[PDB]
């Protein structure tokens, strides 16, 4: 029993974060084999192809706890900067460089001066941003997600938007959303809830007990998205509805019957009530989030 | 920017998980220099779990009943003593990835990170409140006794928690690495209950003094409070009573921000008497407790 907003183990992470510093800048790097992958504007309207020209290899210092590693190349690949040094990482664990879809889930190990200090759960947001804890010198940190044995990179910080929200890219340089590596008027889009995952989240109380939302009612998937429309979630689709499948097996709740609930939830409220300690329909769990931690799979 | 329930990085603790079995029970342990440290209850059978004795049950056992696993490499068992609800394994080969480390007795309000495993290895962390009732609100399945709680301040683990039990209500109890048991629960399959839980006051306050930091000021009012009358007003909510230490705690808080401890106390009081009216703190519209003022000051 319980449920918790779960972070996959950091340490396959942990052995992999480095302090990047380039002139007066210092921020994060993570590496993998014999590459350092950093944020470009470790160098910085900039013209990032001729600030790296003007740089030279020794013009990097890259600090493993209290090892200096020494750069031998230097190459950018999009919004990443790769440092290529003369060791590889003996901790590289097995890894893949993912690029996520909004509402998929992952854990960020957030880290200062190449140092990891926490480490907490949170979801691309439908507008591209994360819902992030992060002060100066946060840049570099990274998220990811672990399936048996291999840590899938998924995303690098870069920077904290107006509203306190953060926007970063994918390991190999792309940003997640409309936004650019600049300082210049950049703002989040209109947010909207991961459907999906209010619907995995209640699948989780009713398999910790918690009832009081269920009703003997059902819904079309059509009227359903015209009332989620109505509340800014997001659209339901069929994959999703096959997703919760196993859920919808298990509680013997079928997931257009858990969608009036849900539709009962949004035109009412709580009335006083709440569910797994939240008084908030909780969107950042995934449906396999919630099997995972309702099941026990180790790492 | 921005405020996370924010765990420690586990990998310190990760390189001390083991799988320990004892006949037919299998539960985690955690493996420090040449010791492992596991529930007591690992040598118990369900009957035995009534009324068991455990030094007439450890009396029995040889070191070869004990299987130590540390990822694929079987450990030998070379000596085994009881501490209190803690079983101490002695192993012929230190951990070569034992951290600098402490073990600590935390109090009601403290906070730790809980590394839950299952068969010795890790699968996932999350930041959890030693309950005001001894209880934590943990995430736990079957397999998952001898998961422990931790803190990291500076290079050194302080271990704090390991699991044993799970309670009627859902909810978990357990020991410090010394055996000592939190609150007035037993390793017994007795008649067992969490005693009635309260909102940790001084938490609760920290938490909004982070929202003042991050910017959000809607609570506030022009209002101060004596302690006695704030604390006759926090036992009616169920709140625990907030002592002139807690007062003294959030000082620095105070002189951050610039908001009185009686001036927030205030803002608390109206909280607890209108609710948030549609509006959120920190992305919460429940008033936080598991963060304390050590954890504010930390994040923020
Ligand atoms: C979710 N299940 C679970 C989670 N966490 C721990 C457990 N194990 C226990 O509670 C065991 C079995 C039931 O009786 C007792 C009584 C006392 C003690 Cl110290 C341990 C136990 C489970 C079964
Ligand atoms: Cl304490």
Known sequence: SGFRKMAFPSGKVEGCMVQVTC??????????????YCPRHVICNPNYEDLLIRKSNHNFLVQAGNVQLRVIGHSMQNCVLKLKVDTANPKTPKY???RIQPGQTFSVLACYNGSPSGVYQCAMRPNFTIKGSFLNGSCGSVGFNIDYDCVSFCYMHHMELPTGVHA??????????????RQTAQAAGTDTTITVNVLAWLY???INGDRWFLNRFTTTLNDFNLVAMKYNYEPLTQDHVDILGPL???TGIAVLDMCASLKELLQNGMNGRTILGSA??????TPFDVVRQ????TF
């Open 96 to 98: 893949k460089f993912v």
């Open 280 to 285: 908030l329909l909780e969107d950042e769990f």
């Open 168 to 181: 970063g890219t994918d390991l190999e340089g792309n940003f997640y959303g409309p936004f650019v590596d």
């Open 248 to 250: 919808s097996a298990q």
């Open 294 to 297: 309702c099941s026990g799979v």
């Open 23 to 36: 002139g007066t800048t210092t921020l994060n790097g993570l590496w993998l084999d014999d590459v350092v």
């Open 204 to 206: 989780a109380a009713v």
